[PDB]
């Protein structure tokens, strides 16, 4: 018994590791996104 | 001879009002252009 639970304390450290890549993914993305507003902003001072 | 003095003023400030003209037609062009790159850093911090 103390060694299923070694694994599924394992399992819920995996769990929270893969959430921390999964809201990571979700961060760049969005880091993504404004820095395709800062290029169309300097796009546009190109343009001026 | 006055006639002649009367008309190089005239052309001066003739060329000088065509020139403010200019420079105020020129300003109201590229304020068009920095407020659309402030609606670019409005909708960056929309973003971050």
Same mark, same amino acid.
């Given at each position: 018994?103390?060694?299923?639970?070694?694994?599924?304390?394992?399992?819920?450290?995996?769990?929270?590791? &893969?959430?921390? %890549?999964?809201?990571?993914? !979700?961060?760049?993305?969005?880091?993504?996104?404004?820095?395709?507003? &800062?290029?169309? %902003?300097?796009?546009?001072? !190109?343009?001026? | 001879?006055?006639?002649?003095?009367?008309?190089?003023?005239?052309?001066?400030?003739?060329?000088?009002?065509?020139?403010?003209?200019?420079?105020?037609?020129?300003?109201?062009?590229?304020?068009?252009?920095?407020?659309?790159?402030?609606?670019?850093?409005?909708?960056?911090?929309?973003?971050?």
């Amino acid at each position: 018994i103390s060694q299923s639970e070694t694994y599924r304390r394992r399992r819920q450290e995996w769990e929270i590791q &893969r959430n921390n %890549a999964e809201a990571e993914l !979700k961060q760049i993305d969005a880091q993504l996104k404004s820095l395709a507003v &800062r290029r169309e %902003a300097a796009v546009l001072q !190109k343009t001026s | 001879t006055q006639f002649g003095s009367t008309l190089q003023n005239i052309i001066e400030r003739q060329d000088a009002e065509a020139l403010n003209a200019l420079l105020q037609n020129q300003a109201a062009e590229l304020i068009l252009t920095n407020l659309s790159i402030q609606d670019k850093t409005i909708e960056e911090l929309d973003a971050e």
